[PDB]
Symmetry: D2
Amino acid sequence: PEAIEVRKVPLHSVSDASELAKLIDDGVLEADRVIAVIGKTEGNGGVNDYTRIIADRAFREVLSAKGNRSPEEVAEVPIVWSGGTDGVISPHATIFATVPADKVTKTDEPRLTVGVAMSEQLLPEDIGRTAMITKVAAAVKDAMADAGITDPADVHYVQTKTPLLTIHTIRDAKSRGKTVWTEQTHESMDLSNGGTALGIAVALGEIDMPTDEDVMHSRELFSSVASCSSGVELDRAQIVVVGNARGVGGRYRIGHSVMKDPLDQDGIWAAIRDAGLELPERPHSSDLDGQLVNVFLKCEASQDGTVRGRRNAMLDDSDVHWHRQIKSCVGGVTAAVTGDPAVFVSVSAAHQGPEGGGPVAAIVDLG
Amino acid sequence: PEAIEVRKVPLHSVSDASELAKLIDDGVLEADRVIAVIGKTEGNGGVNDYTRIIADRAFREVLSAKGNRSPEEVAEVPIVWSGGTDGVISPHATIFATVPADKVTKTDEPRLTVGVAMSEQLLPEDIGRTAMITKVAAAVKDAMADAGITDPADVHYVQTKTPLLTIHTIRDAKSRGKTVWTEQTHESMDLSNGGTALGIAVALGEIDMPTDEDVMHSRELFSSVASCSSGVELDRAQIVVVGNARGVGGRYRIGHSVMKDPLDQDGIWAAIRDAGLELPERPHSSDLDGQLVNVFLKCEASQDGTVRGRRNAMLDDSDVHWHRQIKSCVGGVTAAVTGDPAVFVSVSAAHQGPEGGGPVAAIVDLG
Amino acid sequence: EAIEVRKVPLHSVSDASELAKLIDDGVLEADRVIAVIGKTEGNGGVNDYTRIIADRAFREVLSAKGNRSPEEVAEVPIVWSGGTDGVISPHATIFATVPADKVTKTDEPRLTVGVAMSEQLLPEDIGRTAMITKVAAAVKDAMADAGITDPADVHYVQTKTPLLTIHTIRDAKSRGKTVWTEQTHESMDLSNGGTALGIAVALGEIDMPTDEDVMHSRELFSSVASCSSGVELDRAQIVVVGNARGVGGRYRIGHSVMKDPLDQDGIWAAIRDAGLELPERPHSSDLDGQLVNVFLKCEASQDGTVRGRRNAMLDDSDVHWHRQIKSCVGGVTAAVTGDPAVFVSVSAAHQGPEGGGPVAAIVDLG
Amino acid sequence: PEAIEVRKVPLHSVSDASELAKLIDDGVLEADRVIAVIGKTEGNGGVNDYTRIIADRAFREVLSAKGNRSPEEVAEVPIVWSGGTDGVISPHATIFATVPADKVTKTDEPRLTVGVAMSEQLLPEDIGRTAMITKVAAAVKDAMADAGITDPADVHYVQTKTPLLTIHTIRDAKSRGKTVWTEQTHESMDLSNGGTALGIAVALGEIDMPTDEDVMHSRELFSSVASCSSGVELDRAQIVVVGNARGVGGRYRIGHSVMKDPLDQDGIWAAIRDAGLELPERPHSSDLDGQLVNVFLKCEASQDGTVRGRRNAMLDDSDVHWHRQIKSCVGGVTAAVTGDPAVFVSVSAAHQGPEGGGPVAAIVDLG
Ligand SMILES: NC(=O)CN(CC(=O)O)CC(=O)O
Ligand SMILES: NC(=O)CN(CC(=O)O)CC(=O)O
Ligand SMILES: [Cl-]
Ligand SMILES: [Cl-]
Ligand SMILES: [Cl-]
Ligand SMILES: [Cl-]
Ligand code: NA
Ligand code: NA
Ligand code: NA
Ligand code: NA
């Protein structure tokens, strides 16, 4: 594994990658050393969200223009866009790049490492079933090794992008005598993320191998580091593993915890603590002093329709889906911790953290 | 002035007032002494929000059934319903009732006092112009006297409910050859709140009497205690003035501060401090120990489209209006402070606190 | 019993004044009102509370102006289909019985109405055989109440059944029961679908289906079922409408099918079957006041196309296809009738063929 | 004037231009002879609709790839994307290309002619004011001359694409000490179309030059052929003038009429008649027999909130804006006439036909 440089840049428009271009010009990182991008785009966050492909193309063109890598090489860089920036959430991209050896001093302290992998092809009949779980788990171990990590406890954040079900793939499944878990395009999104999350939890040894009946139903089964996204651009699981390794060097370190509910700011502080920042007992955003790069977390409205004993009407709201409602709410909860509205807040959290909450990972600048 | 009993009760459904009925049966307060209700309803929060009148009638029926007051006496109790409970916000009602002097300890420490008034009828052509401002100012001054307050500095929170513009009233406006400030019903909600806020600010002597040119344009002109809501429940300004008075007694006290932006949790803590709660200097929701009755605050998306230097896309979002996005966001920010999703968070804050923020008032149980 | 049918506008969410005016003008008697079917201007989904507001305004007129007790009025089936996207005008169709001394009873087929309330439908019943069997029994009850023995004489069955809410899902699980789904919005389609199969069983259009058929076997459907769901009553509100000879009256009902959202000919066919003699290519101006209302279902097809052209309704996370296709068919329908007050209802599982729905028409013949 | 070839092709996805590529390969038309595109995209149709630029880029790249025209020449081809395909409306593009004289039959019958222009740059302070009106009028006169039309009566359809107001452009306006007609981005859509429509009406001599106070208020002033759309694709007015000329030849002819209200199917049939299709009285979609290329029309919710005496609640609906409601409704009304869900139905028709309705143009294949 290599030492990693991590930069979070704003998007000034749906098609803006100029801040990545500026980092390259200022020599903060090298175009060809960019190995992964994880960001938030200002689309609706649902099925018909096309701000993800716009941002995807704007960034790959900067990488192709400013580096010696060929456009075919750039296309292999995993870029994950979580649509939907309700409320104060600021569209942004977190850039992961390798550092040249002559810029790193390797320490025995744990420092940030990144691994990437692509699973075997996921067919429409795999989605949400043990076939998806097993294929994802193998890819997660692959990306884990690529990061130079052997201990699952050193994995703090796993970001994925998996296929959805469409009319075309559903027809494809049935034209070979296969079945699909569901035919609702919106619901397959939660299904794809859920099955992928269980895969992550298996590879990392957080749970025992579950059954087909567990997916979307056994919500006590979950991963504490899984952040799963789905879409249509790819028929494979794209895996990005972010963790720590000793003896690699670098300035950044990752840690994680869990949010037990949408208001659990202490869970976020716990992730920042676990990432290696020493903070006061009751910390405030002003205590961070520039040292928080970003946080990455999931959230969801709980099955019981309550938070801390108080009823809300999210699950009954046919006007604005609870996906967008809870995203905005936790966006404010999270940005109030970090002091920076540029936060990675993502919805659809089946088997991703405890029911009604989600995992939270934090990357900090330690030097 | 009279001692006030303040209770915050949940709404278990759109038409539920059972928790108010139970307070009356348990002798916590008397039906005939309820002088104002301020609550959050689970409607959409815009023009076609009819959960406001459903809750309005369900509560007025408990007051009429369980008290000796006539139904037209009850109809003059100002009941303000702020629709829209996006995110975790829990539908609830804050009930204000008078206590007989024989039951409160008349410390000369400042304790809660409440004043009520109804403006003249506000016609659709009045909305957003000097006619609305002058009518509201008169009602605010009357409600201030009704609270037994002479010094405007003792007013911490002015909650209003004013008519907005609908097709019907716009049609009514034109049926007399009269004009309306705007015919976009959704934006007339911001207009009605703004004109009412300026009314409050003049009555309290925070600003000089403004002109028609200033409404919605001179955003440096604002009140520091105005919380203005608009709706379809009544064609007059329902005024509730809440402040403190010495020598009145009671167990509750109000204070206020300002939120500089949607993430300004410290502004909320400042209001709770100003209300008279001793708190640690890095406070947490667990420090409140049941002593926070509720907080009442306004919020809005800033005109420059940024929070703390970070761009957001609220003002360009044609899918989910920024009213609902920022409400959900600030609901989470606020509920994380109080630890109680039952918070009064209201949107559209023209001339209500500084641009991009709003006032925040807090009522605490001191004993 | 001869039936009087009146369609009245709602001037606001809580307005029942036009029903009060019909009673005052002697057009019909409060206690003879036996069913109401209407459109309310709510969102048409789960959190639509304009249905109970209109429910309250109308029931208060009925018992205020009649000798019926508020407990009897509560037994009058009132069906509110929320969502009036586009030009659709909020309205109520009132069905009342006529006193014998005002009726000229003819052997020509004339309108008859039957009503029933099913057994209690619990959240675990929704979408399963328990819902199907309880609805079927109530439909047969309402059918007998209409004085109809032949199912072919039934042209229109309008229902209102509970959907699933967070409250009812909680109650189901607080008794150790399961629910077909926990997505409240999609439980609307489930409740309509299970109720439609119930209607289809009672009328002998299909054999009794299985739990696995609900929402999946879309070749199974009723040709007269119009099923709506909401949060107004925890039972199936049944209204059976058909024709009977020798009863008298001046209204007659007929029906046909809309094969897709644009099938205006299907609507004209229903008006024809109701007994209006119309030109080959009819226009709204040909109706000459004789169309009381039409009642129809619509839905977005699973294959995402209408007449070979793809649309993006099923992928739209911003505005649900329920509201999109309702507005679209509202325009298609109002263009036929010339009257934006049309009963257009969305979510048509097992209600007509896939991608379409039934359409019933009531006409004034004299 | 050149003879025109008109083809309507479906969009199989947001970024699909393959059907245009197929027309070029099959020799139906020449890449470099494509002079205008008018289409419907499956975005939300409001401010944050980015399916317009996605389709814009996909089409210009086919034009640049398959022709000898330079990319900056292609950029001057007016391509108008009307977002929002609510209901059955099918995403599609109508392609207008010139035909070499040697491929058409010279007839003295009126046949289709097309003219194009780009206006002077329109800044955010221009939108909705006399500056926009005068700039658009000049461009329309240029596009009319480019079509070889001298008599305004020969113009049947003027399609435009103009900038609307966003936070960015509003911030740009204020960063130079300028004002904007409004700061409600969603409302500026109606403003941009309205000001452009008055421009068209001036150039065509349908009205006298209006004042700033007339825009959005004097709805008796309107053009009978203007179809104005706004978005974020270009900061200038893209003008397409479509009419008929004698002695030019070609297969296609255009005509127009007016829709008085959303249900006025006869208005649509009248346009098809005027375009030169001999159809039966009481026509049906089955009478068209493949000869209707497309229809292009405007629609809007009337100011008085009624259609044919019946109240609707479109204008009070804060959940789904009346733009999307009436678009879906008229989409069904229109597609039922044509039998083809691929129809150009456009919303927001200020000064475009009479209030509550809009113009409707039809292009037919006559041979
Ligand atoms: N990719 C997903 O599963 C859910 N995504 C959907 C999207 O990005 O449009 C929303 C999110 O990540 O918060
Ligand atoms: N008319 C407009 O300005 C916007 N358009 C949609 C768009 O292109 O943004 C609405 C329509 O054409 O129906
Ligand atoms: Cl190296
Ligand atoms: Cl350590
Ligand atoms: Cl009798
Ligand atoms: Cl051909
Ligand atoms: Na979770
Ligand atoms: Na403010
Ligand atoms: Na159907
Ligand atoms: Na118009």
